[PDB]
């Protein structure tokens, strides 16, 4: 599918840039026409059939159609999309509060921090597991905070990039996230579906917790290792105060067989995060 053609310059103007990464770049900006700001985030295009450089077409177009179907609180929102020969530049909501990454490392959590943070993930995984969409890269830096100057800052989820429609149960593609919160069906290169970001949330609530990463070696290789063995513990000088009800949230997620991992909807129905 084609998008708008047009210089984006010519209706938008760009400002202070929230970040990159290996193959996108995100700046703010401004809509001519309407005064309202956004996110514009210029993904690189691959410019030869067999390059491993930029992002395939394929790929592009997976996550605008994604990101085309949803519209949720939790949620980024997709405005339009341009391109030229060398980007697929996609105007996103402007989320100003910076990575939840970074509102963690500035200051671990209460359970009711935590959990506040948690019900809005878990809210907008909710919606998009209904739509049989996984994220497959669900991780802090991932998690953006609208205001982080009020107590229970609002999130939304960005990053669509590895996102996938699960129609048939599962999808067998060699998807593969960041090592500390990616699955091990992901690890093990098995079929994936949405069970693996039940374990990627399972991660986030032991980060959340402790400021402490549950599966993190010295080296990718033994991040990875880890996973799959699932060798991870509560530590005691990190959780001695965490009540066995948020270790029980987080151990039935942190399960290597995702037929027994809890799904969405045990997580809402948990008596960690249940009203
Ligand atoms: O640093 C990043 C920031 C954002 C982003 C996306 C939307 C917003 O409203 C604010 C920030 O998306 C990204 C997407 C990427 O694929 C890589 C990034 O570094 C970012
Ligand atoms: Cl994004």
Not at 27 to 46: D, H, M, N, V, W
Not at 55 to 73: G, T
Not at 96 to 116: H, W
């Amino acid at each position: 599918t084609v998008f708008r053609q047009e210089n984006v310059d010519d209706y938008y103007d760009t400002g202070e840039e929230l970040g990159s990464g290996q193959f996108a770049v995100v700046k703010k900006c401004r809509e001519k026409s309407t005064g309202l700001q956004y996110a514009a985030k210029f993904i690189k295009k691959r410019r030869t059939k067999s390059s491993r450089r930029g992002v395939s077409r394929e790929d592009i177009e997976r996550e605008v159609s994604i990101l085309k179907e949803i519209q949720h609180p939790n949620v980024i929102t997709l405005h339009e999309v341009y391109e030229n020969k060398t980007d697929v530049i996609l105007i996103l909501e402007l989320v100003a509060g910076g990575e939840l990454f970074d509102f963690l490392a500035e200051k671990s959590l209460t359970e009711e921090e935590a959990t506040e943070f948690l019900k809005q993930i878990l809210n907008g995984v909710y919606y998009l597991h209904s739509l049989q969409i996984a994220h497959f890269d669900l991780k802090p830096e991932n998690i953006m905070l609208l205001d982080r100057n009020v107590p229970k800052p609002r999130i939304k989820i960005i990053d669509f990039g590895l996102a996938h429609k699960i129609d048939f149960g599962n999808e067998f593609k060699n998807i593969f996230g960041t090592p500390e919160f990616v699955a091990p069906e992901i690890v093990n290169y098995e079929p994936l579906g949405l069970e693996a970001d039940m374990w990627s949330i399972g991660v986030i609530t032991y980060i959340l917790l402790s400021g402490a990463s549950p599966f993190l070696g010295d080296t990718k290789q033994e991040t990875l290792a880890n996973v799959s063995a699932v060798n991870y513990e509560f530590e005691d000088e990190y959780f001695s105060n965490t009540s066995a009800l948020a270790k029980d949230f987080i151990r039935r997620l942190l399960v290597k067989d995702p037929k027994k991992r809890m799904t969405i909807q045990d997580s809402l129905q948990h008596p960690w995060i249940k009203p």
